[PDB]
RNA sequence: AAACUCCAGUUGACACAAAAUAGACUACGAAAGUGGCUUUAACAUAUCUGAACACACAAUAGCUAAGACCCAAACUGGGAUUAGAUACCCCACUAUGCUUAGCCCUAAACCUCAACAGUUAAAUCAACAAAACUGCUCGCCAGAACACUACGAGCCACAGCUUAAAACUCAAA
């Protein structure tokens, strides 16, 4: 995380472009030379910019710094921004049983429901002979129980030498969702 | 809260020594149990816990006590051999 | 080792032998009345007692050798310091009567000033505590700085940025950009000095 | 004055509840324990801060912070010959009351007999 | 006379002095050390604060508060707000049993402040609160 | 990381919560239990054993009802970790821990060592543990597992407790 807080009085870099507490732009000075203006003026230095290449930093009160961060928990707060979506690996084998592929599918339902990624590997069973074809019929059960729920994000594709299989499932967007809904309403009117 | 502030656990600085005036205060605090006490008071030592940690160190205190009078009674024998040869 | 644990080191320093007996403290008078009945190795075909022994120079040199190719470093090395001299004497006569006093002519003066510019004060050691290595700030050792502003000059002249210049010529203009506290070598120096500070707050995962 | 022993311990004949539950016999082994070497801890960090807080006032410069560098030179010098002079005097015994290996040959001269003979 | 390591009592005669000040007037400095952090708050003997510094406020984040550098950082901040104020001896009372508990004072002295007392005000209930359950690892 | 930001520090005011040190003491009580202060009441039996057919009790958790609420905290929610993490780690918060009035009657309720009386000699004594025994009495036990189970019966207990089997199975446990 990177926090709205008095960066001290040790700048990592030399160069440091630097702004008053009111705004007005006081050019790029060496850190050295910011500190003395910390003391000068009693004020504190924070980063307001860091991927500008001439790092921006800004001096401010202590009472200005906590009203920025008043303001920047409000405007999260209501306008809060979707997570990372998060990656959830599952490895089965092809002769898994039906009572643990039940409990690995009801899993997988719980990560679609929390608009996660599922990435499912399954690999060639213990002293097992066992074909692509069936291997990837695992992924069609599974995507069953789900059927406006989930979709294939990655298809079914051999990795690991052609060992075993890999897809990753996702949720249906909202435009999908409304096409299935779409559908399956004109196949209730037809029947 | 209700007592009269700087008097206890406060001990004076004398000729601009520090750390001596620190490691006293430590010392006091470490004789008076005060440390161990605000270390174990950290997370809920259960009753059943206590009693066994008690029990513990009240028989370590009494073979430590044990061993070390034991020590100290046979140390005048650590003097040289006044046999040596037979 | 084909020397028996007996043998001792020889002590090459004439000015040690000529020393006078009543000069010695009884300490030095026993050192010397017992090397008289120990066994000495012999001199290894490096060192001698000249006048001109230079026991840095002689270090740097072999950490410069390939592959036993003493003849070559040794060539190498006073072909740069021909170099500096050279260059010096061009700054010197070329410069005012003032900036004379001020221009270092020996490159024996200037090779080892320009080490001393380049030894790193503080060193990063990684430290384990709690299971977990830790790369801290440590004290380094006086042969330790010695070493790394060697490694650090030679490895910089060893790079392939520089395209057909020939190493007399590098370490040449390398020794006299450190001699005044410049060049990349001088930049390593400050960038470990940089990460030793940084990593401040991890000082106290040393126990030494 | 060590601890009573009287009435302690879980035993037929005393009628009160155990005070103590040791896990070991109360009873004096004939060896003490190993000197327990002491946790180490970082030194001179006081000397090495103040070097890097003169390198952070002027740009990492050695030249103005010589006085400060030789500072903490000397005190790794101090405190590496420190490494040795302990090591040679924990091993002496010179701070020590007794040395494990020396007080466990007395405990073998008079071993605790806890059996009869 | 010779030293006492016990406080003048207040409203006694006591004939020890500090700038013309007594006991009962020195400034006091109080170090709260924390686990993961250390604040310290530099008062007067009337309660009129004078400076406040933490391991936070220094510009350390995370696990770097917690650490004695860091406390020593705090100090030397706490103290040169103060000396500007016109503080040179302090009274220290230091509450908790942090990494910052002696390093917070050291960051005092060389800060220029000079320490005449050590108090130590951590909280010890005589029977309280429940603490949190033990952890498990 | 999340969480809070009417937040944090100093000072003052301020509990229906819990009871440093003393305690290296070894006491009280039938056991369960009982370690802040004060006061009142108060700790059966002038032989012993003895109620699973009774009576009175009985940690913690739990139930019903009305209150209090600092802190802790099942559950639950959030953060992290992980192949997964219904956990271990961090945060929030509830039942609950407290009081009052009734229930429930269970613990590794184990000091796994019954009460009373007596002994330290003889053979001291499988092992380990906390040395070996005598008299007397009550209670209990008789291969493992099935089984703190089934059924019956009793109970303010209704997913409960108490008592408690058999068939099949094994040559061990
Ligand atoms: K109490
Ligand atoms: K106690
Ligand atoms: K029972
Ligand atoms: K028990
Ligand atoms: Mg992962
Ligand atoms: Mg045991
Ligand atoms: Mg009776
Ligand atoms: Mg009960
Ligand atoms: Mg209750
Ligand atoms: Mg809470
Ligand atoms: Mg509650
Ligand atoms: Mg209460
Ligand atoms: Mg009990
Ligand atoms: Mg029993
Ligand atoms: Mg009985
Ligand atoms: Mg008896
Ligand atoms: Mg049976
Ligand atoms: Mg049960
Ligand atoms: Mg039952
Ligand atoms: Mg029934």
């Not at chain 4, 807080?53 to 405190?79: H, M, V």
């Amino acid at each position: 995380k990177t926090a709205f807080s008095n960066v001290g009085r040790k700048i990592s870099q030399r160069v440091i472009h630097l702004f008053d507490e009111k705004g007005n732009d006081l050019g790029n000075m060496h850190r050295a030379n910011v500190i003395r203006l910390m003391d000068e003026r009693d004020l504190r230095l924070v980063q307001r910019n860091t991927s500008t290449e001439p790092a921006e930093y800004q001096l401010m009160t202590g009472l200005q710094i906590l009203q920025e961060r008043q303001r920047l928990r409000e405007m999260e707060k209501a306008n809060p921004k979707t997570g990372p979506t998060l990656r959830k690996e599952l490895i089965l084998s092809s002769n898994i049983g039906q009572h643990d592929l039940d409990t690995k599918t009801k899993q997988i339902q719980q990560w679609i429901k929390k608009k996660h990624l599922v990435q499912i590997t399954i690999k060639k069973g213990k002293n097992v002979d066992v074909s692509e074809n069936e291997m990837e019929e695992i992924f069609h059960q599974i995507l069953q129980t789900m059927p406006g729920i989930a979709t294939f994000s990655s298809r079914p594709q051999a990795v690991q030498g052609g060992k075993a299989l890999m897809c990753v499932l996702r949720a249906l967007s909202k435009n999908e969702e409304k096409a299935y809904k779409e559908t399956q309403e004109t196949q209730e009117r037809d029947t | 809260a209700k007592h009269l502030k700087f008097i206890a656990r406060t001990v004076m600085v004398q000729e601009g020594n520090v750390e001596s005036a620190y490691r006293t205060l430590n010392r006091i605090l470490t004789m008076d149990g005060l440390i161990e006490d605000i270390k174990h008071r950290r997370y809920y030592e259960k009753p059943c816990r206590r009693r066994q940690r008690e029990s513990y160190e009240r028989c370590r205190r009494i073979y430590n006590m044990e061993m070390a009078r034991k020590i100290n009674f046979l140390m005048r024998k650590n003097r040289a051999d006044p046999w040596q040869g037979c | 080792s084909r020397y028996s644990p007996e043998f001792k080191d020889p002590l090459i320093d004439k000015e040690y032998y000529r020393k006078p007996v009543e000069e010695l403290t009884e300490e030095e008078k026993y050192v010397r009345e017992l090397k008289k009945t120990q066994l000495i190795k012999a001199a290894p075909a490096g060192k001698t007692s000249s006048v001109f022994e230079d026991p840095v120079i002689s270090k740097f040199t072999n950490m410069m050798m390939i592959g036993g190719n003493k003849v070559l470093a040794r060539s190498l090395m006073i072909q740069t310091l021909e170099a500096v001299k050279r260059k010096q004497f061009e700054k010197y006569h070329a410069a005012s009567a003032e900036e004379q006093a001020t221009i270092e002519r020996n490159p024996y003066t200037i090779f080892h000033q320009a080490l001393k510019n380049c030894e790193p004060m503080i060193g990063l050691v990684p430290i384990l505590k709690g299971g977990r290595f830790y790369q801290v700030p440590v004290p380094l050792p006086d042969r330790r700085r010695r070493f790394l502003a060697m490694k650090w000059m030679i490895t910089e002249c060893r790079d392939k940025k520089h395209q057909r210049t020939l190493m007399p010529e590098k370490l040449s203009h390398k020794l006299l950009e450190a001699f005044h506290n410049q060049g990349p070598v001088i930049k390593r120096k400050h960038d470990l000095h940089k990460m030793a500070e940084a990593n401040r707050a991890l000082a106290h995962y040393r126990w030494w | 004055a060590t601890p009573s022993l009287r009435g302690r311990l879980a035993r037929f004949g005393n009628p009160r509840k155990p005070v103590l539950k040791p896990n070991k016999p109360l009873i004096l082994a004939n060896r003490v324990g190993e000197r327990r070497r002491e946790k180490g801890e970082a030194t001179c960090i006081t000397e090495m801060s103040v070097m890097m807080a003169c390198w952070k006032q002027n740009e990492f410069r050695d030249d103005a912070c010589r006085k400060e560098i030789q500072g903490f030179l000397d005190c790794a010098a101090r405190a590496q010959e420190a490494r040795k002079m302990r090591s040679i005097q924990e091993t002496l015994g010179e701070s020590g009351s007794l040395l494990p290996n020396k007080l466990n040959k007395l405990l073998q001269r008079f071993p605790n007999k806890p059996y009869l003979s | 006379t010779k030293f006492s390591i016990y406080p003048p009592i207040p409203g006694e005669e006591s004939s020890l002095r500090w700038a013309g000040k007594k006991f009962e007037e020195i400034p006091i400095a109080h170090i709260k050390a924390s686990h993961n952090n250390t604040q310290i708050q530099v008062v007067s003997a009337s309660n009129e604060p004078l400076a406040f510094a933490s391991c936070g406020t220094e510009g350390f984040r995370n696990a770097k508060k917690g650490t004695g550098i860091a406390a020593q950082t705090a100090g030397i901040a706490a103290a040169a707000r103060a000396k500007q104020k016109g503080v040179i001896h302090i009274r220290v009372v230091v509450k908790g049993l942090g990494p910052g508990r002696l390093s917070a004072m050291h960051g005092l002295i060389m800060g220029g402040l000079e320490v005449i007392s050590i108090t130590d005000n951590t909280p010890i209930p005589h029977x309280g609160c429940r603490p949190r359950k033990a952890r498990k690892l």
